[PDB]
Amino acid sequence: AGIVGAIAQRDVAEILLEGLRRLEYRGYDSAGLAVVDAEGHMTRLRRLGKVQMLAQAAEEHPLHGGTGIAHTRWATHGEPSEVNAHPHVSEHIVVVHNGIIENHEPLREELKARGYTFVSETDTEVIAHLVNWELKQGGTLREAVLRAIPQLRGAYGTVIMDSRHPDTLLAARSGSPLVIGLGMGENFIASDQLALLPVTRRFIFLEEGDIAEITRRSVNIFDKTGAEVKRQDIESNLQYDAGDKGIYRHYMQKEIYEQPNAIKNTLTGRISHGQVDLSELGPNADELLSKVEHIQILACGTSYNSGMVSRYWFESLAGIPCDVEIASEFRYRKSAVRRNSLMITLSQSGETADTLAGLRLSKELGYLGSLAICNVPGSSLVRESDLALMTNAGTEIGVASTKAFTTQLTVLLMLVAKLSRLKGLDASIEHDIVHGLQALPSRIEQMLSQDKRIEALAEDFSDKHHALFLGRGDQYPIALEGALKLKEISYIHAEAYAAGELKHGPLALIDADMPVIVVAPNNELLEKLKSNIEEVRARGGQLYVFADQDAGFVSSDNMHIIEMPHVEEVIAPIFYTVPLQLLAYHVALIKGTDVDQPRNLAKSVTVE
């Protein structure tokens, strides 16, 4: 379940154990480690149970040495026991293993008929004995492993050492992940980079098939053949940019105006022959998804707002039950899991602590599985989910989310077709969805071209300290987002409310210092809201209405129609986000606030 390896000048056992602690979120039923001093004395220590047991034993009888491998196990072959736990040995050959060697018994009898005593049930032990064999005939660890790897079928990863030669480790990625961590005169490796953070941030991710020879001072990478490939050491990931601001003053402004392009990119590879094509999920996929009867979405901030929009879509268009929840609230409560529930997480950054906690928790609760909708490749939410859909918006530098939100919405709309319930309705539905998606980039462009009007409109808000945003249905979460945006970058106390709840409280607040915005109401809703604002005429209440030019609404003295171009219904919520983004942007511009880095806010909330 977890692998860790170190080759250093200092004692590495403490580091190995700490690595395993940090791998506890996965696995596991047993654990163990094996280290080696300079004289070649290998000390091995294994327990059935928690890592804490192993650390306990390790404490009162310390392991000394600068070379070592450690492992946490989730048994697949052989009952959980100290006997079957890793590392496994073949005399001087020591091995840790993740995944499965599929052809175990063939090779095990092959080697058994060669003098090898299999003391365990695991498929792993075969690895050890085989490496032993191949080393029997000259060469050293590398050549040998290079021969042995092809003789193992299966998705797996393994780290291998010879205690007669502590200066080298060998690794093999063949269906299960491994990453190397670069230290100073020492080097590490693990099944996930989470394990190496205490000790390094320089990583070399192995490619599928790669084989690595690691020393204190060197790291050589090859493939199945043995031909020295080179791999680069990433760290991040979220670089900026300059520069890439182009004709725009601010990262956030740029990110607003690139939304058509970002959406095009989100659509790329996912539309064909007038249908939604999510085949990128896998050959299976279309079959895990078929079993889903309920959707649970978890997110924070703006991502929560996108989830909130998607609920309306899933329930009305696809006919699937869908719940959306603040991740903080999910992780801290005992919940009731619905039958056949898909867990979806929404996250720009993929690192938000609350949302990650929610996903991990979901794993113990009996969810069908998880899908991450995310904007940053190789992030934690992505690595830890069963399925992932990247938004492809490009890096987003402004602290307030803009393109990340509209691309999230795009992907969520794409899921609707691929998850319908509710068949027969039906092709009319996926049809309308795809037509809308095809229209979307241009509709956004239309909307961006209203910027001068929105920029003029912002003068009505730049001296305000309160605002109320109203919305109904698939537009309520758009009002939420518009309010959040005004909070974020202009510091105005803007609050969103469901349109039908105005009379139940907020109406008592409305006056000249608290403008009311409604997002895309139909005529019936508007009549109701006009009547409401008439109730507070004597205090100078103003209604602002972003609405379809086709609707024919007529401005009055206390109600200002801000007409917009027509849109396909199915994408209207995405469309109507843009003006609210532009409004917040232009208010901030007038006030002179720090748009890209608003006070007290962070791009990503990753620590607790």
Ligand X SMILES: N[C@@H](CCC(=O)O)C(=O)O
Scanning residues 281 to 300, which ones bind ligand G6P (CB under 6 A)? 299-300
Residue 334 lies near ligand G6Q (rule: CB under 6 A): yes
Residue 123 lies near ligand X (rule: CB under 6 A): yes
User: Which range binds ligand G6Q by CB under 6 A, 25-33, 34-42, 108-116, 569-577?
Assistant: 569-577
Smallest gap from Cβ 499 to ligand G6P, in A, equals 14
Phi, psi (rounded to 5 degrees) for 390: -80, 145
Q: Which structure tokens are listed for 504? A: 């139940």
Q: Which of 541, 545, 498 is nearest to 518 (CA)?
A: 545
Cβ nearer to ligand G6Q, comparing 534 with 568: 568
Distance CA 390, CA 372 (A): 8
Q: Is the peptide bond before 98 cis (omega within 30 degrees of 0)?
A: no
Residues 6+ apart with CB under 8 A from 444: 259, 260, 263, 406, 574, 575, 578
Write out the binding residues for ligand G6Q, residues 11-30 only, by CB under 6 A. Answer: none
Residue 578 lies near ligand G6Q (rule: CB under 6 A): no
Write out the binding residues for ligand G6P, residues 313-352 only, by CB under 6 A. Answer: 347-349, 352
Q: Which of 21, 84, 25, 23 is nearest to 54 (CA)?
A: 21
Distance CA 44, CA 411 (A): 49
**Residue 316: strand, helix, or coil:** helix
Residues just before a chain gap in the chain (C–N exceeding 2.5 Å) are none
How many chain residues are in contact with ligand X, going by CB under 6 A? 16
572 binds, among its own copies, ligand G6Q, ligand G6P, none (CB under 5 to 8 A by kind): ligand G6Q
**Residue 271: strand, helix, or coil:** strand
- Answer for which of 43, 122, 379, 391 binds ligand X (CB under 6 A) is 122
Phi, psi (rounded to 5 degrees) for 136: -50, -40
Residue 397 lies near ligand G6P (rule: CB under 6 A): no
345 binds, among ligand G6Q, ligand G6P, ligand X, none (CB under 5 to 8 A by kind): none
- Answer for which of 53, 75, 197, 509 binds ligand X (CB under 6 A) is 75
Residue 74 lies near ligand X (rule: CB under 6 A): yes
User: Which range binds ligand X by CB under 6 A, 97-105, 292-300, 561-569, 593-601?
Assistant: 97-105
Q: Which of 373, 413, 374, 409 is nearest to 271 (CA)?
A: 413
Rounded to the nearest 10 degrees, what angle do helices 259-267 and 403-418 cross at? 30
**Angle ∠(587,588,589) on CA atoms, nearest 5:** 90
Smallest gap from Cβ 533 to its own copies, in A, equals 11
Distance CA 401, CA 396 (A): 7
User: Which range binds ligand G6P by CB under 6 A, 72-80, 385-393, 448-456, 597-605?
Assistant: 597-605
Cβ nearer to its own copies, comparing 27 with 358: 358
Distance CA 207, CA 230 (A): 10
Write out the binding residues for ligand X, residues 352-411 only, by CB under 6 A. Answer: none
Q: How many CB atoms lie within 10 A of CB 237?
A: 10
- Answer for which of 371, 479, 520, 584 binds ligand G6Q (CB under 6 A) is 520
- Answer for which of 218, 316, 340, 442 binds ligand X (CB under 6 A) is 442
Residue 399 lies near ligand G6P (rule: CB under 6 A): yes
Cβ nearer to ligand G6P, comparing 338 with 360: 360
Distance CA 502, CA 517 (A): 12
Compose the 319-348 pattern: x for residues touching ligand X by CB under 6 A, - for all others.
------------------------------
349 binds, among ligand X, ligand G6Q, ligand G6P, none (CB under 5 to 8 A by kind): ligand G6P
Residue 597 lies near its own copies (rule: CB under 8 A): yes
99 binds, among ligand G6Q, ligand X, its own copies, none (CB under 5 to 8 A by kind): ligand X
Distance CA 465, CA 511 (A): 12
- Please give the residue ranges that form the binding site for ligand X (CB under 6 A): 1, 73-78, 84, 97-100, 122-124, 442
- Please give the residue ranges that form the binding site for ligand G6Q (CB under 6 A): 316, 333-334, 473-475, 520, 569, 572-573
